[PDB]
Ligand binder design. Structure first.
Ligand code: MG
Ligand code: MG
Ligand code: MG
Ligand code: MG
Ligand code: MG
Ligand code: MG
Ligand code: MG
Ligand code: MG
Ligand code: MG
Ligand code: MG
Ligand code: MG
Ligand code: MG
Ligand code: MG
Ligand code: MG
Ligand code: MG
Ligand code: MG
Ligand code: MG
Ligand code: MG
Ligand code: MG
Ligand code: MG
Ligand code: MG
Ligand code: MG
Lengths: 187, 128, 53, 147, 136, 225
RNA sequence: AGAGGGCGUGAAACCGUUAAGAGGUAAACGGGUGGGGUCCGCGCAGUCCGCCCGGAGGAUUCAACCCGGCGGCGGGUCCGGCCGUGUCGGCGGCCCGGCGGAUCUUUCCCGCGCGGGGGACCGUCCCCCGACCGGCGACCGGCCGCCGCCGGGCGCAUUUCCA
RNA sequence: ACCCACCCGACCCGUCUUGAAACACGGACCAAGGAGUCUAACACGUGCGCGAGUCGGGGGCUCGCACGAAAGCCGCCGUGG
RNA sequence: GGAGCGUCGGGCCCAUACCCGGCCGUCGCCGGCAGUCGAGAGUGGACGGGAGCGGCGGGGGCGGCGCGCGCGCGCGCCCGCCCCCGGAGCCCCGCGGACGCUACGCCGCGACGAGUAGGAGGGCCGCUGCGGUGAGCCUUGAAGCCUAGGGCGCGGGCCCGGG
């Protein structure tokens, strides 16, 4: 008899993508290979991200991709995003970029290409740079989802600012006993 | 002078008797078919000394000889002639079973074809 | 009983609602019937607009 | 797809995943939102702060369309018009400034979030913010009230 | 591609046949009857297939052109080899090796031809061997 | 192209074979030295006492540096403070053992697990027999048997420890690099005590097997190793 | 009728018999052997096949080679032409290229300041040839090399078949 | 795998229970039947499509529906959510 | 004259505990393999001038960074070469690459494996009906039923023989 807890012996990370789609799965076959045979950890990070959920690979807006490449020095590079590239209607002038993405929305595609931008697929990125050399690996804001505003220290727990799940906002949906001082108390 | 398989190792089995179901002996309503007991007290399900055994993955067969017939082959249930020609390039490792529901005319047609291709048949001398 | 976080929600299934469930298996059959009846009315008001006034 | 659901995997086991000390009885809490004050209170006042109690003024014959006032931010004002108004402008050389009827596009108020590009406009709208006005003037434009 | 359409097909094709813990595949120009990527007639730009001759004597090799698949009518190109066993193999060998065509296959293609030339063994001889037929 | 490369590859081949020879010779001389070192250590303890004894004097030799610690009772119903220390000595299973350098900290940790272990001061021979018969590396967290020095070197060679012999000298003299050589060794899975024990549950002093038995840990080692 | 008028199939409980085996700790059970039965696989030597080789017998045409024909592959000279990507030149399709636009013009036209259609303009999609480059499985034609098949040649120290 | 013998082991299951071989209940035997369903609402997770949008209903245009009470399309494409 | 009681020896007995080995599963390994040298790895390769037995004349270190299977060499004859795998013959081969590669595949190393309530995963486990699909099966006998017949699977179960 041995004393170990077998409690957290199984690591819960993903191995493959849970999706069954065939084009992504080909990318996975390609980046598994590169991951293992190259020294590049870029390939490993990319590989890891191909297995993740929709939630877990959030969309990267065009404006966010602009400003991250506006940063000093990462000039004449390629931005990479395992998610999708979306438009920003609240940005106007779009520099000529180099981009990798699993998806780019039709607007975002036009705007970039009109600028003299190049768009790449991930099979194309590999041939272009199999060890991820000269890349900017970005990500969309993970904690964008409105979901997260309900997460945390519960509402009605002093110093929480945590959206309650409520049928409809309005004068008479919550905001009585436990928010006003006038009505019982407040947190 | 029957069809020898490619490699005829010693199959070695961990357990030979069927695991039978608790109290299948006592009752005609209970069938031998294994069932794990889920009873709160249960001699068997809590592994007492002297009781019927519970199947585990412990008893598992060795992967080399799992599904290996005594003869050394694995079955493959052939359904008509066309379905045989698959085994053509195995023959030394898989044999052909012919199905129960196949007619005694075309049972014959299969058997002689397998005899050309040297695929061993596991129920040939039968329907007649 | 409520369990840890969720909309404290009021469904309106306390009356005998299954007595008054109204299915829509008609609707295709309906949609046609209107459409026939429509084409008939055109044909009756011969060169007059199908529209109406 | 019953095939996939949990009751298929519970077959054989006695309690059906509801335990055997305590069982699956009918309504052990009370039905629904029963006990909001008594015996379910803690859940109510740690996930629904402010359920109980009145507050504010009644309003008898509310009609929502009176208070209709959909807003738009400067952020994306140029979105309302075709790019070639914003292009034939930063060009032209008359110092023209194209009109943007915001009420046409379905917004009544113009509030002031965001940077407006240095490029004159005439914004026609039912209502404006203070800041939205200011930003518009700073671009070198003119806010315009409409009924 | 090859790989893309293998993704579509791997588990669903009419030609596949699971059952009895094995799997197989019945698509034409698959030597080895495997549901493999390698050994699949339909998928690959260049294909090998060694069937027996309809005569009953000999073997047919079945190359695939590259010229134009899209036009299956014209795509495969058959060729009977009805020669002295040892020769037959060598002709297949050269077809495969010295044309640099499907080099991966080739030994499988030889064994197939070999097994086919075994098939055309003698049925009467086999019957004599199994039973002694002496002194009733 | 061809004959130039071939000779370059043959040259490479040779330069390896030379180096292999060299490192082998180092190993051989390192042992020979350690043979002389242990000899010198043994005699020069006797030397001392005889010289005290010549005078009306005493030679109190050094208190021991290093001790082997065998877990001599099982893994049921064991107090949480004990249990923690037992898994700070890596003594998880029953009849696992470890070398342990002694000091005020370490000794007291053994004091808190006394009726759960048998321990004491191992011989030279004990350190050899344990290392050669049951010497297993921790090599990418896989218990792997020390079949060659290529294993020891690969892991401990950044300390000057390049062979089984070096390892034995680091363990036995409790060198600078003891912590790292001792942790490299996977804890010693010894069999049951042949000829049995005296009594599991009681201390050595009082007839049983537990606790410090100092010299006599070596007898126990032989009947278990 | 081993379908006989509540009759297709005809399970189990339960009963009758026939055969076999057992029998003072109620029976029944798990593990482990033994004995007996039932069938099943044999063998009237199972010495099991397959390569290659050496020898010994017997038998057909070759392979190796050229020659003629067919088919296939691969190649570069991209040689010649079709093919299409990125770029540049034609402002050439632009009206013989259409849609879209809160871009413009009511110098226009038609219908009643508005609607429809022109006409500018911008965005997008198509012709002409030249140049550079990815010469890309997107194809043809010749030439080359190699392979395979058929038929010609080769009659036997060869190449097969068989024992 | 059928029967018999012998050595060792071996209390009857289900269940509520801190505790069941219990002098705790249910159970003579066999067959068939027999219990976590569907709708609605919410939340989180996951998969797919599109993405500052998205959406399809409801309605309409296309057929006598064999398959169709489907499928397709809509300045309704967005009244509206 | 213990088979009693108190003190102590040797010796022997056996648990699912410990050790070694087999086999099954799970976990872990930034695990390996889409076809390459390489085992404390501590380089490889142009290419130009100047030359050659020269070399890089550094620690009782006991040594890793430098040395004795060659660097230049045997052949063509002091000068030239030091040549190509469609052929070095191979323990490593960078020219092309499994018998192996259903990449949801295949392979290797370690570790571990009680379980009610409860949770999750996988079931080429099982039932009935639908779209597809098996040039499936079936009066030369389907379903069901029965079977001291033959087997497979840890098991849910399954497949064959006979009736
Ligand atoms: Mg556990
Ligand atoms: Mg209990
Ligand atoms: Mg109307
Ligand atoms: Mg539950
Ligand atoms: Mg219950
Ligand atoms: Mg409860
Ligand atoms: Mg205890
Ligand atoms: Mg105690
Ligand atoms: Mg009848
Ligand atoms: Mg009847
Ligand atoms: Mg009937
Ligand atoms: Mg009798
Ligand atoms: Mg109760
Ligand atoms: Mg009680
Ligand atoms: Mg009980
Ligand atoms: Mg009692
Ligand atoms: Mg009761
Ligand atoms: Mg009763
Ligand atoms: Mg039933
Ligand atoms: Mg969701
Ligand atoms: Mg377990
Ligand atoms: Mg359970």
């Amino acid at each position: 008899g041995v004393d170990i807890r077998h409690n957290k012996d199984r690591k819960v990370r993903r191995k493959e993508p849970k999706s069954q789609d065939i084009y992504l799965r080909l990318l996975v076959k390609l980046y598994r290979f590169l991951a293992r045979r190259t020294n590049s950890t870029f390939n490993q990070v990319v590989l890891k991200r191909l297995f993740m959920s929709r939630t877990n690979r959030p969309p990267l807006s065009l404006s966010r991709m602009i400003r991250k490449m506006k940063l000093p020095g990462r000039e004449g590079k390629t931005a990479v995003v395992v998610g999708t590239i979306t438009d920003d209607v609240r940005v106007q002038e779009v520099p000529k970029l180099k981009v990798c993405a699993l998806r780019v929305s039709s607007r975002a595609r036009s705007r970039i290409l009109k600028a003299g931008g190049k768009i790449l697929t991930f099979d194309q990125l590999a041939l272009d740079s199999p060890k991820g050399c000269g890349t900017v690996l970005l990500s969309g804001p993970r904690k964008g989802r409105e979901v997260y505003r309900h997460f945390g220290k519960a509402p009605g727990t002093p110093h929480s600012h945590t959206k309650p799940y409520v049928r409809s906002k309005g004068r008479k949906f919550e905001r009585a006993r436990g928010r006003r001082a006038s009505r019982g108390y407040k947190n | 002078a029957a069809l020898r398989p490619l490699v005829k190792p010693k199959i070695v089995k961990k357990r030979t008797k069927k695991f039978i179901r608790h109290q299948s002996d006592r009752y005609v309503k209970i069938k031998r078919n294994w069932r794990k007991p889920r009873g709160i007290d249960n001699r068997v399900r809590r592994r007492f000394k002297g009781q019927i055994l519970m199947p585990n993955i412990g008893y598992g067969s060795n992967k080399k000889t799992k599904h290996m017939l005594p003869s050394g082959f694995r079955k493959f249930l052939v359904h008509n002639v066309k379905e045989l020609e698959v085994l053509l390039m195995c023959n030394k490792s898989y044999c052909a079973e012919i199905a129960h529901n196949v007619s005694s005319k075309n049972r014959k047609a299969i058997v002689e074809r397998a005899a050309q291709l040297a695929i061993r048949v596991t129920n040939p001398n039968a329907r007649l | 009983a409520p369990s840890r976080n969720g909309m404290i929600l009021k469904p309106h299934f306390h009356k005998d609602w299954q007595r008054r469930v109204a299915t829509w298996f008609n609707q295709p059959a309906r949609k046609i019937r209107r459409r026939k009846a429509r084409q008939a009315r055109a044909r009756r008001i011969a060169p007059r607009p199908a529209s109406g006034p | 797809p019953s095939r996939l659901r949990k009751t298929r995997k519970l077959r054989g086991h006695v309690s059906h995943g509801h335990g055997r000390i305590g069982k699956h009885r009918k309504h052990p809490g009370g039905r629904g939102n029963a006990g909001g004050m008594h015996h379910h209170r803690i859940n109510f006042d740690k996930y629904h702060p402010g359920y109980f109690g009145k507050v504010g003024m009644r309003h008898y014959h509310l009609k929502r369309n009176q208070s209709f006032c959909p807003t738009v931010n400067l952020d994306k004002l140029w979105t309302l018009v075709s790019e070639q108004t914003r292009v034939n402008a930063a060009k032209n050389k008359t110092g023209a400034a194209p009109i943007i009827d915001v009420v046409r596009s379905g917004y009544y108020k113009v509030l002031g979030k965001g940077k407006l590009p240095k490029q004159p406009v005439i914004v026609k709208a039912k209502f404006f913010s203070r800041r939205a006005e200011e930003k518009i003037k700073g671009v070198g434009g003119a806010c315009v009230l409409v009924a | 591609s090859a790989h893309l359409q293998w993704m579509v097909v791997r588990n669903c094709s009419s030609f596949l046949i699971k059952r009895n813990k094995q799997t197989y595949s019945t698509e034409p120009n698959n030597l080895k009857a495997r549901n493999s990527f390698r050994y699949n007639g339909l998928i690959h730009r260049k294909t090998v297939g060694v069937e027996p001759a309809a005569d009953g004597k000999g073997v047919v090799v079945v190359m695939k052109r590259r010229s134009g698949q899209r036009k299956p009518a014209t795509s495969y190109v058959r060729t009977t080899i009805n020669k002295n066993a040892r020769a037959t193999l060598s002709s297949i060998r050269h077809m495969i090796r010295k044309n640099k065509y499907h080099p991966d296959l080739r030994m499988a293609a030889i064994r197939r031809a070999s097994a086919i030339l075994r098939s055309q063994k003698p049925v009467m001889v086999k019957r004599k061997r199994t039973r002694p037929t002496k002194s009733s | 192209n061809f004959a130039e490369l071939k000779i370059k590859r043959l040259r490479k081949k040779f330069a390896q074979k030379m180096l292999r020879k060299a490192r082998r010779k180092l190993i051989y001389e390192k042992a020979k030295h350690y043979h002389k070192e242990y000899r010198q250590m043994y005699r020069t303890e006797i030397r001392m006492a005889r010289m005290a004894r010549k005078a009306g004097n005493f030679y109190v030799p050094a208190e021991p540096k290093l001790a082997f610690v065998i877990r001599i009772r099982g893994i049921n119903g064991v107090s949480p403070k004990v249990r923690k220390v037992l898994q700070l000595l890596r003594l998880r299973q029953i009849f696992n053992g470890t070398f342990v350098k002694l000091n005020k900290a370490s000794i007291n940790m053994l004091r808190i697990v006394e009726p759960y272990i048998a321990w004491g001061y191992p011989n030279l021979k004990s350190v050899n027999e344990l290392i050669y018969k049951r010497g297993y590396g921790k090599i990418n967290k896989k218990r792997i048997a020390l079949t060659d020095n290529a294993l020891i070197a690969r892991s401990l060679g950044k300390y000057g420890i390049i062979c089984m012999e070096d390892l034995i000298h680091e363990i036995y003299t409790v060198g600078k690099r003891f912590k790292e050589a001792n942790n490299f060794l996977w804890p010693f899975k010894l069999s049951s005590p042949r000829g049995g024990m005296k009594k599991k549950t009681t201390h050595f002093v009082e007839g049983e097997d537990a606790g410090n038995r100092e010299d006599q840990i070596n007898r126990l080692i032989r009947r278990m190793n």
